[PDB]
Design a binder for this molecule. Structure first.
Ligand SMILES: Nc1ncnc2c1ncn2[C@@H]1O[C@H](COP(=O)(O)OP(=O)(O)OP(O)(O)=S)[C@@H](O)[C@H]1O
Ligand SMILES: Nc1ncnc2c1ncn2[C@@H]1O[C@H](COP(=O)(O)OP(=O)(O)OP(O)(O)=S)[C@@H](O)[C@H]1O
Ligand SMILES: Nc1ncnc2c1ncn2[C@@H]1O[C@H](COP(=O)(O)OP(=O)(O)OP(O)(O)=S)[C@@H](O)[C@H]1O
Ligand SMILES: Nc1ncnc2c1ncn2[C@@H]1O[C@H](COP(=O)(O)OP(=O)(O)OP(O)(O)=S)[C@@H](O)[C@H]1O
Ligand SMILES: [Mg+2]
Ligand SMILES: [Mg+2]
Ligand SMILES: [Mg+2]
Ligand SMILES: [Mg+2]
Lengths: 399, 399, 397, 387, 82
DNA sequence: TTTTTTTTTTTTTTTTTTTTTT
DNA sequence: AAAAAAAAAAAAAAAAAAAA
């Protein structure tokens, strides 16, 4: 080795190969990078070995794959494969735990892709410690990193997780690999969310959602079924907003029902929405747009119980209230994003590009967004993007 | 050797070289200091080596740079460089991992600035045990502080972190080096913040905020939704406040809508503020300034959902309420800062100099502050700092 | 020799720095013949603090500053930032314990400051610079020098990655005083707190603010000053509250106005509105202020949360001054809990409170009379015992 | 058993098995600065009234100890100080005094220079301890040992000392506590677990005799609407005062503003008084507080709360030496309470003339003769007896 | 043990105390080869119960009573109250 | 024939990780 | 929010042991 000037452009471009799973490719950042290390953590049972077996089958159509498993015997893995089904043209399988015995086979198969079905179950013969020991994990991961960086092998490592929900072993492990994925999914849903917390080769904002099914993990193409309901005739008082949950844009319906107050102080009731925010929005509508609302009771709901924290919902909430009060329908493919100011201005929102992209992917026609958010934003040309400046403009255009 | 002197001693000055990233220069106390040690810690994948490759390029425009790394090969570094820039001042890469060859090549090329990358990923063949040993990093740190002082090389060091997020290694590491930086970001946010916990050459309070983007880190300059020209021109009931978001001042905007109640009682709906605080402020206004407000509803909001609960916002809240009740605008170039006492006094506030300086940087023309806070303040030339001591003074000056 | 109880003792000649917020932590001043240990996180400010101490003590006696971790140029550059060498002192930057022992015997300094015992070493043994044996022998040498020359020694000790002193636990036994210098990244105050001091109370902490011109002592941590009340401002009063161990001054403010619409609000901040409405009920029953038909609005100034029962008297006097439209004197302070019978009940730490009010230059403090039993009033403060709220209201207004 | 000498700190006796037995060792460990040397100087001075005492110190020269003694002020009849570290010289001074109560101010700062090790060496301290054992055995001297502690607290070589040591107890306290707790952990001659507690002061350590948190008796004159109740701070009984202000609802509607108590419990209590006693409280505001901010909320308070409310409504004073304990039922029955014996004994210790208690709870308890324990059945009976 | 296939069977030698209201809470008696754990509210009778049970089992067989938490003198002085 | 010494061992302290407990 | 289980390292008590 020698020091070199940066203009010694020995950099060959990374011809990263795509698997068939677009959800997997996107989290990785376009594809599997040769010579990368990917560490997949996640709770027991969540689907890590299923995911890796699927991608191993798909990659075996394009390159040689070696699947290495300490924790499971070859018959179990073949039983899962036949439950999933693939030609498995060049898919090698190797149940092993001794690092020298895997390294020897790696140096003859020359696998383009290597799966390590659990790092905590594979041991160096050098280190005396138990298979989950910190020193064992350190030595095995350093040897795998040598194999990867020397032979351009892409290595997928399954990591055991502590009861905290964070990867076990020395933090050196998270420092040394190139990509760290978590695989997780709460019991309220069937969906399994794959997310990158580190990715030296791509954006860590991309997340992939799978559903676990008999016969494998299948991609879910719409994360949010809860909007899907085609509207009744009439159906006044509904609007749709591209809100946000964690990092993924999710599109959700807001509904309102405005009715004349009787025999009490006018009272306002919500679900999934802060009633303070709704009271503000109703005050803005009554002031700036002249909707008589201090004599109306109002009821607001988000479909599917998705809780709408962020201020970007306020414009869609106002449009829902207006649609109910006017008793006139919005279009089922109009979508609304923006904070509503008490001076009636529509205020810019973060992540505007992702929201417009997601609205385009779900096939909406018109998305209304704050005019000042549009600066330098490139729209997808298939969806009409309307920049709006004040609530009176939105009401006059929608109604 | 055998010194021993009175305090009359050479007092040699410290020169500084600024990077082009003012957000980075700020944290170091105004620029890189020759012969200093700066230690960078932070979560895996946070952006440390992008930041250091950016600053490595900028220093490379004004001096020779040697970038060592044991983490990554020269090809990966060059691919990153192409991703984030034009290679407009080429510098040296060295993929070395053993300290003797580093010391050799650094003595031969004799750089102005040196970057180690991770101190935990370099070892010394003369001593001790495993990579990342406490025994190893201590001795490498001693070698670096020597090489630094013998040559006046400024050295930047990446440090691993524990799972708790504190710097790894023996505390001798955190004592021998001169500057210790943390690079961090909460998962609910897009920003990365860079903060000093120790800095022998400047204040630690100055943090720097970056956004991660496809072309690298970019300094945000404005951590807030307050973009001045957002204001709806004819807007009334809005005012801006300089608020401490922890250690950093941020702009925030307080909006009020004030309107007569059409019921036997009046609402006090408030988002982002304590409604008891707003109710106290309206009682101060009604008693001292004579605004008839018990007949009026008030609705109050903070822009962008920022939670504003420090006493310094009371003045801007009072001015927003008064602006709405009077239906007169305020100039969007004025900031307000001050606690409001039930006497109508504007009480002094903490960190007043930071607040004035940050109001100055984003180009505000006036800021109203407690007059008693003005003592010893270095107030910048570009902004007229208007001392005030009663709410009625503010209302006469502004309305 | 067992000299029984006949040995003769002379009072320690406690010298003082100008930083009273430092002197308080040592329990009144710097004793001679003594070891002080300063611990704290890296970067906290220990060297800045001991530089300022050196420069101040140099006005009283000879100071020698030694530092194995920092060159004399860096120390002089810091001193030039902090101020000027008008009180010039000796600076050695030595690492050899034998050399500093010889130099101390030559110069006979009144005060010695060692900025890292983790870098002094003696050649009689060798090893890692911070080795337990090296620090133990060096600190034994320092215990000799302290006794032999009556020298006050300030030692900077390193700290582990938890907030505890490194090196042998025997260290905290040999030394006479142990200080931790501590702070929090969300803040910018530094607290200096003792964990051991056999020459004086360890119930006192010093507070500092790190600034460009050094560690400024924060004599008054509250945003509460006698200079800043509006001349005729009614409806506020001062109370000596306690933040754990530290007496903290606080102002309570009250706005009383007729309840023109609806029914009586009791909107409150920093206080508790149940406490406040109790106090208004006591005033209305016992003192006769017609406060039922009044709205009342109360806040702590400065956003300090007030919990303890000692605030009741100050809150009552703030309400009463707001109702009566008669200002309280800004230099009078109130402490005491209010009973629903209108009695004023005893409070804890009464002496530490009166001492803090005296030290902050309050001309007068009101206290529950029965708490005066066995009390030791300072000279610079007038202390008034009161028995009932009627007595207070007659005396104040 | 063999006889016990008592120090004047009865708190110290009770943790030390009821008193220091002669001819045996005691080791007090604890964090530096906790107060070991102050405690042992007070103990040694109190024992000086019984016989000769020697205090040996390496870690503190005689002048500093004398300064501390003159701070505390206690008279020091035949109190010996000895600044020494040569253990053989200590042993010889033992025979030049023949003490009766010996103190070593730290085992880690005395050395027999011939034998072994450095002053910290486990062998050196163990062997010094083995010599001390012979000196204890020979002259029946009770020897108090100060222990250093490990960073963890484990007495800096615990096992080999502790088996020779007989009795070990730990002196400790937290960063903010004015109190320091002296916990006995092993003891051949008394309750193997106990906790002594002291407050540290500039006058020296002072016992916490009676509970830590009682603060009372600031009663004024004709203070209607006040009553006293015995309540538990877990296992400690404490004696606390309830105050009530009852006043007509001149404006608005009846408030129930309450602090310390639960306003639901208080609402039940005023409903019970309204129905069973016939107090017209529904048109009254009633304001209730526990004195001193004590979180006084356990079922046994309801009788005292009822008597405070009734005293305030009637505007007649409760006697300042009457105490009440009792749960109140919605039928006006007064129900049993958890630990009535301990409450009556605390009431007696604080010198209360009466305690009112639930009848059906006097069965099988030994009423102390100094206090008039009164059984009451019903709230109407209580209000007849008191008012 | 080494060889079994549902064979050797000493059965439960269930040994009573004189208090049947103790025996009834177990299987009608104590069981050899077993650990019984007793908890309870502190000082309420927890040790009094087991000391008395010892004074009743001592009639049937040898009982060794070990206390880390109380002195042998105070133990025997309490037992004398029985 | 004691004196290093040096392995072996204890054991303590620092530090990092992780299983319980609100 | 709190503890206890492994890893790494230094301090040290001890002895196999070869010297000086
Ligand atoms: N018919 C089915 N047959 C087998 N597995 C199924 C079936 N249906 C669902 N599964 C799911 O398959 C999951 C098993 O997880 P896998 O993908 O096989 O491996 P893994 O548990 O993620 O990896 P580890 O290291 O063994 S914890 C379980 O959570 C089951 O819910
Ligand atoms: N298009 C993008 N391409 C590459 N990286 C991206 C991209 N967008 C964001 N990144 C971020 O780049 C981060 C990697 O930053 P790095 O500086 O290379 O790693 P580091 O952990 O900070 O430092 P080391 O010592 O190299 S591990 C990832 O965590 C991503 O979040
Ligand atoms: N203009 C400024 N220039 C230099 N330092 C400043 C400045 N302003 C504030 N500082 C503070 O100075 C602090 C440094 O404190 P130090 O005096 O180095 O304490 P120390 O770390 O204990 O000293 P040692 O013994 O050398 S490690 C930094 O943490 C800064 O917060
Ligand atoms: N006016 C006061 N004067 C002197 N000491 C005080 C005073 N007030 C409190 N103290 C306390 O007295 C303590 C002094 O420590 P000691 O009473 O000597 O116990 P000790 O430190 O354990 O003794 P050893 O065995 O030498 S370590 C300190 O912790 C102080 O907090
Ligand atoms: Mg598996
Ligand atoms: Mg890197
Ligand atoms: Mg220093
Ligand atoms: Mg002592």
């Amino acid at each position: 080795t020698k020091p070199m000037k940066l203009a010694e452009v020995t950099s060959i471009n990374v011809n990263r190969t795509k698997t068939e799973m677009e959800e997997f490719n996107r989290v990785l950042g376009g594809g599997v990078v040769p010579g990368s290390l990917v560490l997949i953590g996640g709770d027991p049972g969540i689907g890590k070995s299923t995911l890796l077996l699927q991608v191993s089958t798909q990659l075996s159509q394009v390159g040689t794959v070696l699947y290495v498993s300490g924790e499971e015997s070859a018959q179990q893995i073949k039983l899962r494969a036949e439950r999933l089904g693939d030609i498995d043209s060049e898919f090698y399988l190797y149940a092993e735990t001794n690092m020298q015995s895997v390294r020897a086979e790696v140096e003859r198969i020359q696998p383009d892709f290597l799966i390590i079905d659990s790092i905590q179950t594979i041991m160096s013969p050098e280190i005396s410690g138990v298979q989950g020991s910190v020193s064992q994990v350190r030595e095995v991961t350093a040897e795998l990193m040598q194999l990867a960086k020397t032979n351009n092998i892409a290595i997928f490592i399954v990591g055991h997780v502590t009861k905290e929900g964070t990867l076990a072993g020395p933090r050196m492990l998270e420092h040394m690999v190139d990509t760290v994925l978590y695989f997780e999914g709460e019991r309220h849903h069937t969906f399994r969310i794959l997310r990158a917390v580190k990715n030296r080769f791509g954006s860590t904002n991309e997340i992939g959602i799978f559903e676990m099914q008999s016969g494998g993990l299948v991609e879910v193409l719409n994360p949010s079924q809860v909007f899907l309901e085609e509207r009744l005739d009439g159906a006044t008082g509904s609007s749709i907003v591209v809100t946000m949950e964690g990092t993924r844009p999710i599109l959700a319906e807001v509904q309102a029902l405005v009715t004349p107050t009787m025999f009490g102080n006018a009272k306002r009731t919500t679900t999934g929405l802060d009633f303070n925010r709704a009271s503000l929005i109703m005050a803005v509508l009554e002031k700036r747009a002249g909707l008589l609302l201090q004599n109306q009771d109002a009821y607001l709901k988000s479909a599917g119980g998705v809780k709408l924290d962020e201020p970007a919902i306020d414009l869609a909430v106002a449009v829902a209230i207006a649609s109910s009060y006017k008793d006139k329908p919005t279009n089922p493919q109009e979508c609304f994003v923006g904070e509503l100011g008490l001076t009636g201005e529509i205020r810019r929102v973060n992540r505007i590009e992702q929201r417009i992209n997601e609205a385009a992917k779900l096939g909406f026609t018109k998305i209304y967004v704050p005019k000042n958010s549009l600066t330098g934003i490139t729209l997808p040309k298939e969806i009409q993007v309307i920049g709006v400046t004040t609530i009176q403009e939105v009401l006059k255009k929608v109604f």
